[PDB]
Amino acid sequence: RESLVVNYEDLAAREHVLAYFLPEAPAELLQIFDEAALEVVLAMYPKYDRITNHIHVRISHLPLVEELRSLRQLHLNQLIRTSGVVTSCTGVLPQLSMVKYNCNKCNFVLGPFCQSQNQEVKPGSCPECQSAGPFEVNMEETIYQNYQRIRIQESPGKVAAGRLPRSKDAILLADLVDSCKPGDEIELTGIYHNNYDGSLNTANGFPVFATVILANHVAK
Amino acid sequence: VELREAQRDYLDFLDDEEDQGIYQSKVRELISDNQYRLIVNVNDLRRKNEKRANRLLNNAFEELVAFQRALKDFVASIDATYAKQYEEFYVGLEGSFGSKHVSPRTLTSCFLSCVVCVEGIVTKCSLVRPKVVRSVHYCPATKKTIERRYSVYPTKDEENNPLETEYGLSVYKDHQTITIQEMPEKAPAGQLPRSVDVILDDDLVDKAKPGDRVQVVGTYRCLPGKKGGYTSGTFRTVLIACNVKQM
Amino acid sequence: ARKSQLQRRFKEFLRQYRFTFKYRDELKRHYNLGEYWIEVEMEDLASFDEDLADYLYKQPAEHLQLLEEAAKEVADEVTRPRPSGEEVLQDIQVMLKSDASPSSIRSLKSDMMSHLVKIPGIIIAASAVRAKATRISIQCRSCRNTLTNIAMRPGLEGYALPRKCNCPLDPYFIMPDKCKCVDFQTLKLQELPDAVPHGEMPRHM
Ligand SMILES: [Zn+2]
Ligand SMILES: [Zn+2]
């Protein structure tokens, strides 16, 4: 496998500082935990450098957070836990990672570029020929990742009378793909995100931001 | 050298009066009937010159241009008075092509730049439109006339004087586009039909109507990718007709 | 450099495999009849030499071109006394066939990128056959200079015209009368109803 499960209760019991910093800084702390887990696993077994080069760390339990209705400005860039029902699935899609580009004039292969989820990769220029023209993706050597999108709606039983259920979008990557069937009830722990290009409505209308949840754990 | 030899062979083909030929009488009838299109049987040309027929079938544009030049020379020699009216003449084809008798379903890229014969039904037709050949402009400020040929529309003089267009002095030719679909009586059952696009010019514009069964002989060519820094590498193929027949 | 040696190995495999020369006679007959295509069973290649067979599984794009060139050379060497007029040596398409069991379409993931796959399914849509260029020529606007025999890549990949003339910028245009074209088609495939999971929608390709 390529994933590891860590309980928040044990982490809080052992080291309080990490548990305290965890909700208000998910990305960097998760990266540090992934690095530490990879180092420990490689220390335990040396062959994995041939099999899997990275390991993900996922939080299993958390203090239960409010439903989809209460998600507001106070939860920006924080870690939240919600429960809902799956209504749609986009399937498995390939996304770029460590992209290598082929120059158009010469045949130099540019160095790998980290594929951020906020903006598209824009290579500067070819080091040898110094050109800054169009580039193409080296399909043979580029690394790819799994991507999936899900729409989640509140459980009809828990919806109060006189109001309608509300829905939100979530993104699953790597091992989380194909873990939920449509129409099933799930619980997610995720990050409430806005910092992605195109989120701000600029062409017309009010300056309204669109929110997207990045999940890292699924509970049936 | 090759074009000149082809023109010489085409000129030699027509002079058949001393060899029980009919094409001289056909040209005389065309002059009498005020027509500027001649139909030549492919079988007779193959009988008289197999190499020229093979070259024409495997290469159409250059051979057709050479044959039109030869016909122009022949009509000039017969009566140069008649040749003054029209700039160039046009060629029609008839006969049995054999392997090149191709249905809309069996059209492939192997027949590019060749002469093909198709049989089908008409489903789509377009309005007749004029196309410019020559343009004449006049300058009232300087009383000067300019001529342009087409194969950019001027609007101002050298000293920025306005120019007025003379529509009557210009030259226009008819143009139309039609669509040919495979006959349902021959298409396989349960499969969608396939269609081809044909362009008609000059006197062949009003010889087809929708819902009619026709046979069209013409050249098969691609359309180049339009202007752009990036190309998809896929070209559209459109038939250019030279003869249409009501079966 | 080494790719030339691999092409030579493919040539030797085609010319030497047998107790009758199967591929040699098949290629000769196909070239004589006018069908410029052959089918290669990878079990025969593995029997002849396991190295090239293993290589084909991981980098099909380059080894396929090498095999096509080797097959063209073999066909040229077999048919020396070709009839007059048929001096031009035509290209040959190479197809692959194997007896390995197929894999479900649902197993396609990131790790299978740029690899060779085998998938069962059912066809639901087939587009019309169209033409795609393989060799093109371009002409400049001002000086009318010409660049000829530009090779085009296979698959759904375009081409970028040069912007510098060796004159205004971007002066090149494509001449339609001097290009070679081949037939291509696009199809739609759907997951087999016998293999779809219960209560789940099927997927397409
Ligand atoms: Zn470069
Ligand atoms: Zn130039």
A146 closest CB neighbour out of C109, C114, C201: C109
Using an 8 Å CB-CB cutoff, list chain B residues near C161: 229-231
CA distance B184 to B181: 9
Ion ligand 2 — residues with CB < 5 Å:
C 140, 143, 145, 165, 167
3-state secondary structure of A78: coil
Give the Å distances, CA to CA, from A78 to A72, A112, B146: 11, 30, 75
Q: How far is the CA of A132 from the centre of ligand 1 (A)?
A: 8
- In this complex, which chains have at least 3 CB pairs below 8 Å with chain A? C
Q: How far is the CA of C169 from the centre of ligand 1 (A)?
A: 20
- The label of the residue with tokens 């009758």 reads C20
Q: How far is the CA of B185 from the centre of ligand 2 (A)?
A: 53
Q: Which chain A residues have any C-beta within 8 angstroms of a chain C C-beta?
A: 91-92, 94, 104, 134, 139-140, 142-146, 181-182
| DSSP output for chain C | -HHHHHHHHHHHHHHH-----HHHHHHHHHHHHT--EEEEEHHHHHHH-HHHHHHHHH-HHHHHHHHHHHHHHHHHHH--SPPTT--SPPP-EEEEE--PPP--GGG--GGGTTS------EEEEEPPPEEEEEEEEEEESSS--EEEEEE--SSS--EE--S-----SS-EEE-GGG-EEEEE--EEEE--TTTSPTT----B-
Side-chain half-sphere of B112: how many Cα atoms within 13 Å?
Answer: 20
Sign of the dihedral defined by the CA atoms of residues A38, A41, A43, A46, in that order: negative
Q: How far is the CA of C164 from the centre of ligand 2 (A)?
A: 8
Resolution, given in Å to one decimal, reads: 3.2
Q: How far is A62 from chain C (nearest CA, A)?
A: 31
| Chain C residue with the nearest C-alpha to that of B59 | C177
- The label of the residue with tokens 């809080």 reads A12
Using an 8 Å CB-CB cutoff, list chain C residues near B222: 131, 176, 179, 181
Q: Whose CA is closest to C59, among C3, C101, C1? A: C3
For residue B86, the Cα-to-chain-centroid distance in whole angstroms is 15
The DSSP secondary-structure symbol of B101 reads B
Question: Tokens for A29?
Answer: 């702390």
Please give the sequence-ordered ranges of beta strands (E in DSSP) within chain B, or none if there are none.
Answer: 37-41, 90-94, 115-125, 129-139, 144-149, 164-165, 171-181, 195-201, 213-223, 230-231, 234-246
CA distance C24 to C17: 8
Ligand nearest to the CA of C143: 2
Answer yes or no: do A94 and C199 touch at CB < 8 A.
Answer: no
Orientation of helix C50-58 relative to helix C2-16, angle to 10°: 120
Answer yes or no: do C158 and B113 touch at CB < 8 A.
Answer: no
